[PDB]
Scaffold this active site. Structure first.
Site, short mmCIF file in Angstrom:
data_model
loop_
_atom_site.label_atom_id
_atom_site.label_comp_id
_atom_site.label_asym_id
_atom_site.label_seq_id
_atom_site.Cartn_x
_atom_site.Cartn_y
_atom_site.Cartn_z
N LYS A 42 0.83 -1.20 0.00
CA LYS A 42 0.00 0.00 0.00
C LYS A 42 0.87 1.25 0.00
O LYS A 42 0.41 2.33 -0.38
CB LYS A 42 -1.05 0.00 1.12
CG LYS A 42 -2.15 -1.05 1.01
CD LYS A 42 -2.98 -0.91 -0.26
CE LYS A 42 -4.28 -1.70 -0.22
NZ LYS A 42 -4.03 -3.04 0.28
N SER A 272 -3.07 -12.83 3.74
CA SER A 272 -3.41 -12.66 2.33
C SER A 272 -2.32 -13.20 1.41
O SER A 272 -2.62 -13.71 0.34
CB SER A 272 -3.85 -11.26 1.94
OG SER A 272 -2.76 -10.37 1.94
#
Lengths: 307, 307
Positions: A42, A272
């Site tokens: 991110k 994830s």
């Protein structure tokens, strides 16, 4: 020269590591976006969404950033805001972790706590309320739909994969949250480099909204533990046209896989990451993908063994 | 090609970022060893001590690694051991954090808990006891005195600094734990590149054993909060001959500095990073070091604002 003017500029050029206990004859290679400022993918979109807002005139000296994410995007935006000297408000449910509260506050965030009972709906609504109160002052970068999200992935993440695989990448496997990584990476390899690879989205079996949509089945999101993916809808930054295949993975297997990455490969990656790998491993063990180089995005790193 | 065979190989090529609120006209640049496997500088020596043991024949397939560090070196050794498939025992006081217990166990460590009341003395003694029981089986890599420690810093960390500063580095500032970083970096720049820089060790004012030693004063270690440095003695991997200057910093200032790195620069670095920066800033604000490029090692990253 090789000196960075601030920490936002230092994003990317992430590793690429070959796995010895996944795939077939080392056909699976894993990126490691954990090797970033703020320790996640991110950082890339946190950087570029700010940069783009600056170029576009939407963000100037004195205007303030407001977003409701209290996940990895917040930390990305928090670091970038600190590095570039912007005020940020992040809105959160009051019931969020002290660790994340302390971390965001430590990064200089103006933290606005919303009603636990309203959840993320509450935080999102309050962010919009704050912007409404003085639009000329506040800027919300909207990660699910902001084009500067997939754009950074097309200009960096994708080329890095191309470059570090001598153009040998055959398959890209990436969990979908905002859809930016898979979208930008695929555009880069398919359109800019002209290699017709297989782009594979990954999503929780518990919330398989991409697969349900594409199958023309009823969209039915659901609860799951795979933090970072399965938002429960199709984000505008997921380009359905560049996806070749969609693989589902369950929370349990994702968790087990993330544990094996740590214990068998010595890579400390988030749940994830385990989801994406579990999916990649399954395709890697089809004869049709035996002679093919599969590159898997490990979006985050875990500071805590989910144990 | 650009694919790594395991995660041990992916060490280094750490950033280099210019600070806007420390030094004078951006004279202070900071490395960011946080950008490593296991998120610390110790990934470097964890890799090289294992590699060297392999070449030297001291570590073979079937022998097991034992060390008593439960700090960043342990995590480095744990990751390397997982990546390379070795059993590791780490000895710890029973009163160590569950987080670190869970993390090390998650990495596949055989964790041996020692008496809280005996502390680190206990853990070190028990590690030696385990080795004594079957030397042909167990290997202790001894980070304070193992030459493969400073050697990796001479072959990687140092050249990276040289390379990324176009040979413009004038000063290197590094906190001393094992002494490996300052030693290896200094040998690289001074002996291999032939630039006569100023090498600056940093240590807690609470435990200024390097300064006391060099001043011919009585060595008097002490308690402090700067995790990673100030071991309370002169390690064999601290080469006194390559040190130019020794700066002391207090725990409070180190803590405040680490906070400012996060809030003013958006860099999430450990208390020892704050210590090194506080020292670098002080020298950077002498006229004698006004036109000089000062490079500071930020040894670790903090997953938790010390707040």
């Amino acid at each position: 020269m090789a000196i960075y003017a601030d920490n936002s500029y230092s994003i990317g050029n992430t590793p690429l590591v070959r796995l010895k206990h996944f795939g077939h004859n080392g056909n699976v290679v894993v990126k490691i976006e954990g090797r970033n400022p703020s320790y996640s993918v991110k950082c890339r979109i946190g950087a570029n969404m700010v940069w783009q807002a600056e170029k576009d005139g939407t963000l100037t000296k004195g205007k303030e950033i407001v977003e409701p994410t209290s996940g990895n995007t917040g930390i990305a935006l928090a670091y970038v805001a600190a590095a570039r000297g912007y005020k940020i408000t992040l809105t959160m449910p009051e019931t969020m972790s002290i660790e994340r509260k302390r971390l965001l506050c430590g990064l200089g965030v103006n933290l606005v706590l919303t009603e636990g009972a309203k959840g993320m709906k509450g935080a999102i609504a309050k962010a919009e309320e704050i912007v409404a109160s003085d639009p000329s002052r506040y800027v919300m970068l909207k990660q699910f739909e902001n084009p500067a999200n997939p754009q950074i992935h097309r200009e960096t993440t994708g080329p890095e994969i191309w470059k570090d695989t001598d153009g040998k990448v055959d398959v890209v496997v990436a969990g979908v949250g905002t859809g930016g990584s898979i979208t930008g990476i695929s555009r880069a390899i398919k359109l800019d480099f002209g290699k017709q690879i297989t782009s594979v989205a990954v999503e929780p079996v518990e919330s398989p909204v991409i697969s349900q949509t594409l199958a023309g089945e009823e969209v039915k999101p659901g609860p799951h533990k795979i933090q970072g993916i399965g938002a429960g809808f199709i984000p505008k930054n997921l380009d359905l046209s560049i996806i070749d295949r969609v693989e589902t993975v369950d929370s349990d297997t994702a968790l087990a896989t993330a544990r094996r990455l740590m214990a068998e490969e010595g890579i400390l990656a988030g749940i994830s990451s385990g989801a994406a790998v579990a999916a990649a491993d399954r395709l890697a063990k089809l004869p049709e993908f035996a002679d093919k180089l599969i590159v898997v995005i490990l979006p985050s790193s875990s500071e805590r063994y989910l144990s």
